[PDB]
Design a protein around this ligand. Structure first.
Ligand SMILES: Nc1ncnc2c1ncn2[C@@H]1O[C@H](COP(=O)(O)OP(=O)(O)OC[C@H]2O[C@@H](O)[C@H](O)[C@@H]2O)[C@@H](O)[C@H]1O
Length: 184
């Protein structure tokens, strides 16, 4: 646990900020989150890395399940990507000029809430998760972390610990300063 920048206490469960590749499972995380699109298609970034390491049956399962509405999440088997299951969660694209912005912050928080409720229903205690929406969907790491730390305030039926993984130390340490700074 030397990769942990900070650990936050939240109703859902502890949220750990971890310097590591999403494809390098944290100890005890058998379930990973895909930062997915509504069509559940392979993309770049985290989605690319998960599909890159999986069988064709994953695309087949997604064909059966698509679309996953923005703000929602849906599970599939992992198909050899290194995890037993994948939670495909769909972040909104960041609205470029409000008021859609405040609407989109709620939808980003909802995506994280949807991950937690899903994991709780499957009795998955730990989940490895990227910073939803912080890649091509335009959010910053701090915006995505702030959303995760808000979403986890909603108490779930069973505790779920989010291990948030990003391979760049500076991105996470920076985000860990900006989150409290907003409230300062
Ligand atoms: N291997 C990786 N491991 C951990 N974090 C990663 C990795 N690759 C990217 N990240 C980071 O995770 C966050 C999410 O970035 P994206 O992967 O681009 O996901 P998102 O912004 O939500 O956009 C989703 C869209 O992009 C496609 O990958 C996906 O199919 C969908 O269309 C960003 O912080 C990104 O830098």
């Amino acid at each position: 646990d030397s990769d942990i920048v900070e650990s936050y206490a939240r109703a859902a469960g502890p949220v750990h900020l971890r310097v590591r590749d999403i494809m390098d499972p944290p100890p005890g995380c058998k379930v990973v989150v895909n930062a997915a699109n509504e069509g559940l298609l392979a993309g770049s970034g985290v989605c690319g890395a998960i599909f890159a390491n999986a069988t064709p049956a994953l695309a087949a399962d997604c064909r059966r399940l698509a679309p996953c509405p923005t703000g929602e999440a849906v599970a599939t088997p992992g198909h050899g990507c290194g995890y037993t299951h994948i939670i495909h969660a769909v972040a909104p694209r960041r609205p470029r000029d409000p008021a859609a912005l405040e609407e989109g912050e709620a939808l980003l928080e909802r995506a994280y809430r949807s991950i937690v409720a899903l994991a709780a229903a499957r009795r998955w205690a730990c989940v490895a998760c990227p910073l939803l929406g912080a890649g091509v969907y335009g959010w910053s790491a701090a915006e995505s972390l702030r959303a995760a730390l808000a979403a986890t305030r909603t108490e779930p039926a069973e505790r779920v610990s989010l291990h948030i993984c990003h391979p760049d130390r500076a991105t996470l340490t920076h985000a860990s300063v900006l989150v409290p700074l907003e409230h300062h």
